[PDB]
Amino acid sequence: MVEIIPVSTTLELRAADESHVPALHQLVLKNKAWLQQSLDWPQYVTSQEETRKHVQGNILLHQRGYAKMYLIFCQNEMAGVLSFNAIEPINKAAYIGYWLDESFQGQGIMSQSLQALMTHYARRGDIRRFVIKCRVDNQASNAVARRNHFTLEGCMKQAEYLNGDYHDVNMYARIIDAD
C-alpha cells in the first residue's frame, strides 16, 4: 500500500513496508560499527528475520497513527531512516528518531527530509509538536536540531544508556501550526 512524501528531485520518503527489509537489514549491517558510536541498539542486530519483526511492528504502528517509520531514498538508493518513534495523538506531539548511511552525511539530506516530514504532518494537522531527544555529546544530532529551528527545552540527566555509560540528553521541540 505505497506511501511517498516528496522531498526533492533526488530525495523522497517512503513508508517502510515488507519489501524494504532485506535492503534495510543490509544497510544496518553495513553501518553497524559506526552507528554503535551513537546508538545502543545496532548491537542487538542479528538476523534479517529479527529485523523483519521489528519493521513489521513499526508498520502496524505506522498504520494506526501511533508511530511512523519512513525510509529515505536518494536517487532510488536506500540512504537512511527518519521516524516518529511515537506519536501522542491527543497532544499532537511526536518524538523523532533518525540515522543516515555514513557516506550520505554532509549533504543536508536529513535536514531536508525532516523539513518535508514535519511540514507534511503539520499541514495534515495531526502533529503540531515535534520533539528531538539527543545525547548532549552527539554533535551531529544536536546540529540537525539547531539547523532545523528546534528550541532547547531542557536536559535530562543520565537519561540514555550507551556503550557502558548513562549520558545526558538534550530535549528540543519545535511547534508548527499550519493555520
Ligand X SMILES: CC(C)(COP(=O)(O)OP(=O)(O)OC[C@H]1O[C@@H](n2cnc3c(N)ncnc32)[C@H](O)[C@@H]1OP(=O)(O)O)[C@@H](O)C(=O)NCCC(=O)NCCS
- 93 binds its own copies per the rule CB under 8 A: yes
Q: Which does 99 bind (CB under 5 to 8 A by kind): ligand X, its own copies, none?
A: ligand X
Q: How far is the CB of 70 from ligand X (least distance, A)?
A: 13
**CB nearer to its own copies: pick between 68 and 128:** 128
Strands, E, within 29-128: which ranges? Answer: 68-74, 77-88, 93-100
Task: Report the C-alpha gap between 34 and 103 in whole angstroms.
Answer: 11
Grid coordinates belonging to 142: 544536536
| 73 close to 83: Cβ distance less than 8 angstroms | no
Q: Which does 33 bind (CB under 5 to 8 A by kind): ligand X, its own copies, none?
A: none
Select the span of 9-17, 65-73, 122-130, 136-144 touching ligand X (CB under 6 A): 136-144
Kindly tell me which residue out of 99, 121, 130, 172 binds ligand X, with binding defined by CB under 6 A: 99
What values do phi and psi take at 72, rounded to 5?
A: -90, 125
